[PDB]
Nucleic acid binder design. Structure first.
Ligand SMILES: Nc1ncnc2c1ncn2[C@H]1C[C@H](O)[C@@H](COP(=O)(O)OP(=O)(O)OP(=O)(O)O)O1
Ligand SMILES: [Mg+2]
Ligand SMILES: [Mg+2]
Ligand SMILES: [Mn+2]
Ligand SMILES: [Mn+2]
Ligand SMILES: [Mn+2]
Ligand SMILES: [Mn+2]
Length: 756
DNA sequence: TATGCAACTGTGGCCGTGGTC
DNA sequence: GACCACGGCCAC
């Protein structure tokens, strides 16, 4: 299989490198013949003689057109002949593309900003990660000597651990008497030993957890201090640390550096993304955490270094196990998109949409539209109407069915052929007309995007059918993550239409999808209520909760299935309402905030404070206990006792101050805020000390006893001292606990006074 | 800023916070 | 006290 591609330059000429693993052997294929190019549409074919003469310069070098070729293509499905302009080196294209666009005989130019090594995959029809080849994988981790107030990596790496199918080991330069610990003389020999291990094992994949942003950079600084050629690359190169906007990423040439952290952070919703928390969530088994401050004391004192080495060994071990489970999911994405796992595992959904479209366009002989210029961008800043959200019938409900459209917006796109190559296209026999916004879509031929979505949705549904019939709970969870990844990808084709930077931008298509969605969901609601005597309790965009008031569970379930048969026969094309579940009880607080309990006692909560990372633990804990008392038991009196226990304890300062921390992310430079909330107030004070606040910095603060603005008396929790600071019990009662639970316990007649 | 030097699919909604009047 | 923009996070 193909692992990756890049290109280097030799004597001015590009050379594509294809990193392969075939029949158990690593290979680099060199392609010295593939040429960069872009396309020009000319006012007349005679003008090619001038265009071929155009020259530019780049750093001393004269840039010329190498050769040209007339080709017949389509643009949004309409046939057109263009000239394919070939050049000697990819960097010729930026240097000359504008001088060609500006030539008076050139109408427009296309496909002039495509990364060369990825262009190569598309045009050659090559897909990374195909085949039955078994890849060799190795995970690693490091333990470091940390002291507060030091520059990054000023202290040495203490241990390097690594794990694979054969087991896990730790390399260190202090004597530790564990069987899996290899002792060497110095930090330098440790690093060199690890380098030797990687070269001997020769893994196809190197697995880290946040190695993109810590492990490799730490190793780099140390290797700069120590004079080490850290030649992990299969071509003898060192890890390449690249900046991609606000964070970094690391390549090891000839291998795939698989950093789990961006994958997990995108797939699993967790309050914290420690390795321990991620391991427990996936496997159900605990992992002890040894903190940076314990690591340093153990090393300086020499006492209890076994515990550090075990912790280091386990980091590698679980990093490996996690990588074993998540690499196959990302490898499927890599094949679906047609790009390397390194890139696919680190990209936003929209970037994957566009790489997929660019490949499908190439296969269909469709020119890509260009990205917008600054003027076109500014023209694309208007919004448009989205999904319909019904105000809920607040309160407790019983015997509730949840019905929900399968992949609604993609299904609309498929059914109504919604696409920029079919919008208001004149001369067709057949059109579908979007409600409210009126855009007309030709139905006589499949639009480009509509014709691609069907295979995605069909693949998702297969994964789902397998997932629901899977006994192993871990394999089922991984199948869930996989079918969810395709759901988000397919919906991102819709969002792409309304995405200002998209090539296949189509705001008319975007708002037609949403308009059809609004029409379908409201039609389904009117139908189930009028023809089946259901009451719709709550509805959001394409699904709703309903019951038959007075009816038992058996009856509600029977009639719901009858409705589905009826309504799915009326719906067109790919549109399908699905039975998503039954809930014996449910509590609806507001739009987007509710909780339901299934017939097995499992509670699911949406939007409520329990699921919010920026509410205090004590508030979330209390609300969770309340909802369990209400929905699982029938004990409203117990729910209130819980609340009073909490307000009493908080008053008596019996609640552990750790449950009172508020976490809120900084999203911009501190100068760009217009209002200063508590987390910005704390962040500005930390900046004044020189701490360095960035977008993505999380402020974890606690509110101290006082009366004025909350940000005036808010401190970071790492500065809290119970011997000096009293937390603001009245604030956590009146501003965290009571608000979250009172919104539920109103429905039973409980005022705030009845709970404190 | 990646031989990918700008910045990461879309809209709807709650609600504490700190302003205004 | 009534009201309102902001901001962060969340549900689709
Ligand atoms: N991440 C998203 N990006 C864009 N649009 C979205 C996103 N999530 C939801 N929507 C839109 C498109 C969805 O089709 C629609 C309804 O959401 P939802 O029911 O969650 O998903 P779905 O109908 O695509 O999948 P499912 O088959 O799991 O119901 O709202
Ligand atoms: Mg690459
Ligand atoms: Mg839905
Ligand atoms: Mn659904
Ligand atoms: Mn749906
Ligand atoms: Mn807040
Ligand atoms: Mn806002």
């Amino acid at each position: 299989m193909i692992l990756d591609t890049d290109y280097i330059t030799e004597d001015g000429k590009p050379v594509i490198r294809i990193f392969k693993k075939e029949n158990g052997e690593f290979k680099i294929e060199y392609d010295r013949t593939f040429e960069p190019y872009f396309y020009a549409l000319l006012k007349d074919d005679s003008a090619i003689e001038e265009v071929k003469k155009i020259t530019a310069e780049r750093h001393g070098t004269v840039v010329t057109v190498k050769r040209v070729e007339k080709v017949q293509k389509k643009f949004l499905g309409r046939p057109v002949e263009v000239w394919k302009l070939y050049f000697t080196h990819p960097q010729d294209v930026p240097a000359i593309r504008d001088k060609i666009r500006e030539h008076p005989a050139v109408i427009d130019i296309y496909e002039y900003d495509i990364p060369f090594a990825k262009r190569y995959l598309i045009d050659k029809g090559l897909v990374p990660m195909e085949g039955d080849e078994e890849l060799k994988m190795l995970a690693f981790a490091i333990a470091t000597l940390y002291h507060e107030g030091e520059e990054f990596a000023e202290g040495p790496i203490l241990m390097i651990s690594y794990a694979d199918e054969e087991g896990a080991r730790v390399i260190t330069w202090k004597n530790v008497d564990l069987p899996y610990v290899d002792v060497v003389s110095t930090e330098r020999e440790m690093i060199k030993r690890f380098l030797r291990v990687v070269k001997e094992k020769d893994p196809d994949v190197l697995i880290t957890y946040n190695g993109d942003n810590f492990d490799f950079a730490y190793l780099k600084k140390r290797c700069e201090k120590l004079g080490i050629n850290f030649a992990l690359g299969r071509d003898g190169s060192e890890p390449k640390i690249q900046r991609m906007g606000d964070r970094f990423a690391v390549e090891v040439k000839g291998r795939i550096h698989f950093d789990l952290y961006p994958v997990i952070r995108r797939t699993i919703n967790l309050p914290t993304y420690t390795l321990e928390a991620v391991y427990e969530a996936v496997f159900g088994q605990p992992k002890e955490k040894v903190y940076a401050e314990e690591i340093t004391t153990a090393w300086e004192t020499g006492e209890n270094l076994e515990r550090v080495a075990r912790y280091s060994m386990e980091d590698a071990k679980v990093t490996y196990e996690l990588g074993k489970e998540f690499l196959p999911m990302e490898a499927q994405l890599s094949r679906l998109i047609g790009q390397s796992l390194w890139d696919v595992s680190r990209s936003s959904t929209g970037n994957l949409v566009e790489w997929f479209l660019l490949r499908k366009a190439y296969e269909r002989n469709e020119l890509a539209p260009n990205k917008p210029d600054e003027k076109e961008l500014a023209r694309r800043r208007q919004s448009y109407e989205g999904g319909y959200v019904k105000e809920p019938e607040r309160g407790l409900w019983e015997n509730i069915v949840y019905l929900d459209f399968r992949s609604l917006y993609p299904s609309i796109i498929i059914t109504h052929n919604v696409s920029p190559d079919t919008l208001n296209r004149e001369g067709c026999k057949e059109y579908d007309v979007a409600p409210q916004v009126g855009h007309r879509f030709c139905k006589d031929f499949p639009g480009f995007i509509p014709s691609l979505l069907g295979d995605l949705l069909e693949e998702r549904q297969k994964i789902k059918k397998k997932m629901k019939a899977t006994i192993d709970p871990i394999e089922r969870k991984l199948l869930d993550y996989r079918q969810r990844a395709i759901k988000i990808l397919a919906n991102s084709y819709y969002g792409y239409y309304g995405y200002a930077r998209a090539r296949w931008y189509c705001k008319e298509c975007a708002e037609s999808v949403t308009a059809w969605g609004r029409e379908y969901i409201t039609m389904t609601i009117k139908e189930i209520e009028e023809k089946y005597g259901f009451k719709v309790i709550y509805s959001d965009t394409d699904g709703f909760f309903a019951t038959i008031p007075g009816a038992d569970a058996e009856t509600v379930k029977k009639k719901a299935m009858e409705f589905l048969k009826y309504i799915n026969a009326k719906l067109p094309g790919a549109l399908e309402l699905e039975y998503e579940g039954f809930y014996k009880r449910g509590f609806f607080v507001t739009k987007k905030k509710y909780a339901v309990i299934d017939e097995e006692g499992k509670i699911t909560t949406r939007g409520l404070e329990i699921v919010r990372r920026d509410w205090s633990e004590i508030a979330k804990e209390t609300q969770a206990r309340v909802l369990e008392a209400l929905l699982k038991d029938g004990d409203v009196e117990k729910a209130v006792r819980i609340v009073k226990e909490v307000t009493e304890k908080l008053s008596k300062y019996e609640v552990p101050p750790e449950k009172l921390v508020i976490h809120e992310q900084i999203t911009r430079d501190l100068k760009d805020y217009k209002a200063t909330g508590p987390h910005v107030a704390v962040a500005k004070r930390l900046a004044a000390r020189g701490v360095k606040i960035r977008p993505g910095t999380v402020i974890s603060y606690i509110v101290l006893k006082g009366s004025g603005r909350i940000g005036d008396r808010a401190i970071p929790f790492d500065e809290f001292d119970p011997t000096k600071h009293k937390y603001d019990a009245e604030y956590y009662i009146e501003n965290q606990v009571l608000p979250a639970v009172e919104r539920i316990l109103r429905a039973f007649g409980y005022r705030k006074e009845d709970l404190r």
